[PDB]
Amino acid sequence: WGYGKHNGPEHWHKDFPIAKGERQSPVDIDTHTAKYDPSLKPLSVSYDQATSLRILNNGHAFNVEFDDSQDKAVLKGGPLDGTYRLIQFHFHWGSLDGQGSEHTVDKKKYAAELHLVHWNTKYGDFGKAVQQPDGLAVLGIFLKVGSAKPGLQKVVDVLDSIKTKGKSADFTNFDPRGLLPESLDYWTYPGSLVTPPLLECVTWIVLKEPISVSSEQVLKFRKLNFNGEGEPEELMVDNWRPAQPLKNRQIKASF
Ligand SMILES: [Zn+2]
C-alpha cells in the first residue's frame, strides 16, 4: 500500500476490506450541519511531562515517538472517558499549498494536518487499544501557509537525517505544546485510522483553529522520500486520503 497510482487509496479496500466500512476517516466537516453539543466538556491536554524519544521515517510519513510507559503526556475530558496516552505524532501534507489535510472544512483543504495519537490506558498497550471502538483518540490540527511556527523548527531541521524509509534519529526534549493553536474548540465524531489497517477505533478531535507555518517549513516536508536508501527517489508528498462518506454519523461541535 502507498499513495501512488497503483497502490493508492482507491486500492486499499482489496487488502483492507474495512476500507468501505461504516465509520471510515477522514471526512468533510459541514459546519452548518455540525451539532452544537452543550454536554461536551473542555479538552484536557497535559503534556508538560512529555518525553520525546525519536523520529523516524516509516515510508508513509515521519513519526515523533514518545515514552508511553507512564501517564506523562495525556489527553482527557472532551468527548472522552478515561485517560489517553500520547504515543506519537505525524503529519499528512500535499505537493502544493492547495492540498494535504485529511479532514476538510466545508470542502476547504489545508496545506497539511497534524495527528496527535493517543491510546486509552484501560487497554494496557496500543496494540490492544487498536482493537476497541473507544481505543484511540486523535487530535487533528490544520496547518495553513503564512508565518513560521517557531515550535515546529526543531522538527524541520532534523528531516535531513531521516530522508529515506527506515531512518530514525534520537529526538529528545521536544515539547508538543509548541504545536498547539490558541483555542481548543473542536469538532468530534467516531471514525477510523486514515491509513491501513484503517481500524475503526478512533474518536476524532479536530480543532477549529489552524496553526500557521511558513512556506519554507512545509517545503522541507516535501523533500522527504517514500523510498528506501539507494532506491529510485519518490518524494513524500500527498500522503493523504480522500474524504469518506459520513453515513449517518453526526459531527458534534464544542462551540
Ligand atoms: Zn495521521
Q: CA 61: distance to chain centroid?
A: 10
Interval between CA 97 and ligand 1 midpoint (Å): 18
From CA 66, how far away is CA 86, in angstroms rounded?
7
Report whether 107 contacts 175 (CB < 8 A).
no
How far is the centre of ligand 1, averaged over its atoms, from the C-alpha of 115 (Å)? Answer: 5
The continuous run of DSSP H or E covering 139 comes out as strand 136-145
Q: Are 198 and 168 in contact (CB under 8 A)?
A: no
Name the H helices within 25-181: 126-129, 153-158
H or E segment to which residue 219 belongs? helix 215-221
Cβ-count burial of 218 within 10 angstroms (0-12 exposed, 13-18 middle, 19+ buried)?
Answer: buried
Burial 46-57 (b: 16+ CB within 10 A, else e): bbeebbbbbbbb
CB atoms within 10 A of CB 245: 11
The 3-state DSSP class for residue 203 equals strand
- Residues catalogued as catalytic: 60
Phi, psi (rounded to 5 degrees) for 144: -120, 145
Burial class from Cβ neighbours inside 10 Å (0-12, 13-18, 19+) for residue 187 reads: buried
Domains and CATH numbers, the chain: 1-255 (3.10.200.10)
Strand partners, 120: 84
SS (H, E, C) 54-116: EEEECCCCEEEEECCCCCCCEEEECCCCCCEEEEEEEEEECCCCCCCCCCEECCECCCEEEEE
Which residues, in sequence order, are CB contacts of 69 under 8 Å at separation 6+?
Answer: none
Residue 128's alpha-carbon distances to 35, 55, 79, 229, in angstroms, are 31, 23, 21, 33
**Cell (9 digits) for 222:** 516535501
Q: Are strands 84-93 and 74-77 parallel, antiparallel or unpaired?
A: antiparallel
Q: How far is the CA of 40 from the centre of ligand 1 (A)?
A: 24
Rg from Cα positions in the chain: 17
Of 72, 12, 6, nearest to 241 (Cα)?
12
Specify whether the CB–CB gap between 27 and 244 falls below 8 A: yes
Please state, in angstroms and rounded to a whole number, the distance separating the CA atoms of residues 27 and 243: 5
The CA 229 to ligand 1 mean position distance, Å, reads 24
Q: How far apart are CA 8 and CA 64, in angstroms?
A: 24
Ligand 1 centre and the CA of 99: distance in Å?
15
